[PDB]
Design a protein around this ligand. Structure first.
Ligand code: NA
Ligand code: NA
Ligand code: NA
Ligand code: NA
Ligand code: ZN
Ligand code: ZN
Ligand code: ZN
Ligand code: ZN
Ligand code: ZN
Ligand code: ZN
Ligand code: ZN
Ligand code: ZN
Lengths: 279, 279, 277, 277
């Protein structure tokens, strides 16, 4: 399997002014949409196993399902644990052979977030896998992170890439977001680490491109892919409600989601970058 | 993994006047619907990997996906290759560690069907996995098999269980089927092997119960499960077209399909029979 | 595969006044000797992958070789990393799916031993595997740990089982050892955790038995098994130097080692205890 | 893992006038000797799992042990079932993911040998693994196959490579063998398939070289490797009977066996040929 450390992918992106897309997986067809998109675009990609899919399918089953679909894939792939709020769950992902983990301690006190994130980072560093932490809460579409908090957190935790609160939120945006570009620029010069953008779904393309120049090197996309999938399925079933061939109904969802992943890969500037990791 | 030879399951069913449900799988949620149904009902089950899913997801990936979802399952499970028209593909399933294979030579000449089916049977017998063959064409809802053809075929091939044409077809039935009960009765006394009913979707419950008494010991169900799945998905998306949580839309499909599998397990008389295979 | 947490095994031993034998593995025949002994005796066992075999065969290859030989085994088995002095190597064993790890920080300062041992313990507890640490150096056969130092170490690290310096050493004993029984008893009552005996090869049987009743619940055996193996091989090759059937020469080593493992299982009081799990 | 069909390897050897060495494995150290030799020589190799090791260690455990030791190997490797006289056992190797199988029907009637060998071949061809059969018995060192019988057998069975009786035998040679070179040449031109040489241990080097130029493209070596292994072990234990470090005693066996495998790789003309795959 062409699996690569998240640290390897993200550092390369950060050093070359592009971002790795971190695409959330939910089942077989969503895994395939992402992998086929990456293989077509010759792009390194992160597949994110997050809290919701863990609750539905299980952490280890989702890892094993990715493994099963890697047979024809030659591009760099990193399996990433998203939004973990448990040291135990994070260690389960490490034991299951993930290539990146996020311990999200953003709801803990600063000191407690530091303590657990550092413990996770030490494990990740030991095993050559990527580690993400978060300082500053990112909520739902339903507190911009300070430079000081981000620097202190980064230095005490030794995280490889850092999620910060910079004007995004998870879900479909009610109001169009406006990213804290000035804050990102300060962090580039002070924190000097790759930044992770949570809540990438529905952020205007122009703002993504700008954010990447300022050191965003991982962009998380989940909702926009599930919307694309749901649109494809809906199209089939609204037109032909007695279409019972899943290869048609869910396969159209797969196709529409694959197009969306291709769109994001290109937005992020990650197309063609697979070549950089062969040698 | 609690995996069991298809021959072991089917002989027990046949000897005890019940049938093993052979439920076709298509993706993660459909695997889970079947396994959760079997675990709840304490029923032995066959999961069928057929031609359409092979074309979409791949033979080995679907096997590996079942393996991934077996973590919490304690009932007897048999992975079965359905509708194979290739010696090569059948051998791939054997190598991938399936517990039953069907070589469907029903479109070949009698002698050619015998020749290849026997070759597959010898491999299956060697490795303690079940083998199914078919004599007589079974088409789509868009030639009842003779006793003589069934006996000769059965004796020359050494198949463990036999598919015959007895009034069923694949797909949604236009006209209600009427099974060839007299023919089944003759076969019970002459062929003296368990019979497989293809085209189990939409057959009246009373006719299934009667057929099982006459020696049907495997009932194949695919379309009716995909209909149930599609109904659940459709319900969510017709009510809430912007519901993008797959755990809700596809999970309702999973739930409605799980209820249908439970309904079939009970129809077949396989509920509670898991106990018979522990010891 | 009948794999069980080291903590589950050792706690049960400690609770019931017996010990789990921790038998060091080196290759295929040594793995088989141990597993066949355990299966015959219906005994829980630990198979220890230590530093020498890691250097020769590799950590992950040795794990996978154990897996390969578990096909016909029904007794509880725990794969244990022995004598790790590296956080990185200890994490490698965790990722490879070991059921117990020893971080041996005994050559570090107390503070640094506590720091790294605690980090390993946190990982082990999260994943339901056993964790061993060591306070006080245990050397070669060619200095007793205090109760207070053992308590402080134990409480700060949260280890499941603890190696202490109690009168043993690794290798062939020059002089006959004398264990610190009274110290063991104090630890049993104050530290209240299972004690691991390093240097179990060649200790008089009566002293082993006594140590186990006083709360030694894991006994490490390596040298005595390699001696048994080597004796069996030597016997064949000295008698028939042109015996080229490895099934005969190395198989006799396997047989003589298997008898030794059976002997240790019984010494430890672990025979029949598979039923409890 | 760099695993390659036996047919792919043997065809390439035959096409280019060299042979693949088929080295019998028995345990961890023997596997490592062979793999390290192949990796050093950048040579494609076959590792043969035969009847004796199946009886001792098991078919599937030996496969899994090879897998465990492939972590650092980049050369083409083919795991081959040797001397199977059971359709069932041959199917077990297929299911365990071997890259080549030998069904040895040479003790059966011609018709029955053809029948079972053909059935095995059909399975092998379907799954892209190599298949070997045998016409004419090859015994122990303590009768030449005809060209016509070899052609009929070959055409009916569709084997990829064929073992024939050509002047060799298994074990330590009592008398020096003399191969049937002219018969080999006839087979090369009429049968037009790669020939397998059983009993490769102890055959004079010049006769091996000549046989390979005449279309022998797989050479089986077992006894000579076990002798090399046994010599290394014996050396250590005779000199230092209380040497209990298996890394020393069995490691010397490994080293001496590795040198022997290197010697055979070069003899066969397979060094450097990894580049071709
Ligand atoms: Na969003
Ligand atoms: Na139907
Ligand atoms: Na000792
Ligand atoms: Na010979
Ligand atoms: Zn977040
Ligand atoms: Zn987020
Ligand atoms: Zn059919
Ligand atoms: Zn059918
Ligand atoms: Zn020690
Ligand atoms: Zn020690
Ligand atoms: Zn032979
Ligand atoms: Zn031979």
């Amino acid at each position: 399997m062409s699996y690569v450390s998240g640290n390897t992918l993200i550092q390369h992106a950060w050093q070359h002014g592009y971002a790795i897309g971190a695409f959330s997986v939910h089942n077989a067809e969503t895994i395939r949409a992402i992998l086929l998109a990456a293989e077509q675009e010759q792009a390194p990609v992160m597949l994110q196993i997050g809290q919701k899919v863990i609750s539905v399918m299980g952490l280890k089953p989702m890892k094993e399902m990715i493994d099963a679909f890697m047979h024809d894939i030659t591009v760099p792939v990193c399996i990433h644990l998203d939004h973990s709020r448990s040291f135990e769950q994070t260690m389960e992902a490490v034991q299951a052979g993930f290539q990146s983990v996020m311990f999200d301690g953003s709801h803990l006190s600063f000191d407690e977030n530091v303590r657990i994130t550092r413990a996770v980072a030490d494990v990740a560093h030991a095993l050559n896998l990527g580690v993400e932490g978060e300082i500053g809460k990112i909520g739902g579409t339903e507190l911009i992170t300070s430079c000081a908090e981000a620097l202190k957190f980064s230095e005490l935790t030794t995280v490889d890439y850092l999620a910060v609160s910079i004007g995004t939120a998870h879900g479909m945006y009610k109001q169009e977001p406006k990213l804290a570009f000035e804050r990102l620029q300060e962090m580039r010069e002070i924190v000097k680490k790759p930044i992770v953008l949570h809540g990438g779904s529905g952020v205007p393309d122009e703002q993504i491109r700008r954010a990447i120049t300022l050191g965003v090197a991982k962009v998380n996309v989940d909702t926009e892919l599930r919307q694309a999938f749901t649109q494809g399925v809906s199209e089939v079933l609204a037109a032909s409600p007695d279409e019972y061939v899943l290869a048609v109904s869910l396969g159209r969802g797969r196709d529409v989601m694959q197009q969306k992943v291709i769109e994001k890969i290109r937005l992020f500037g990650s197309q063609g970058q697979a070549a950089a990791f062969a040698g």
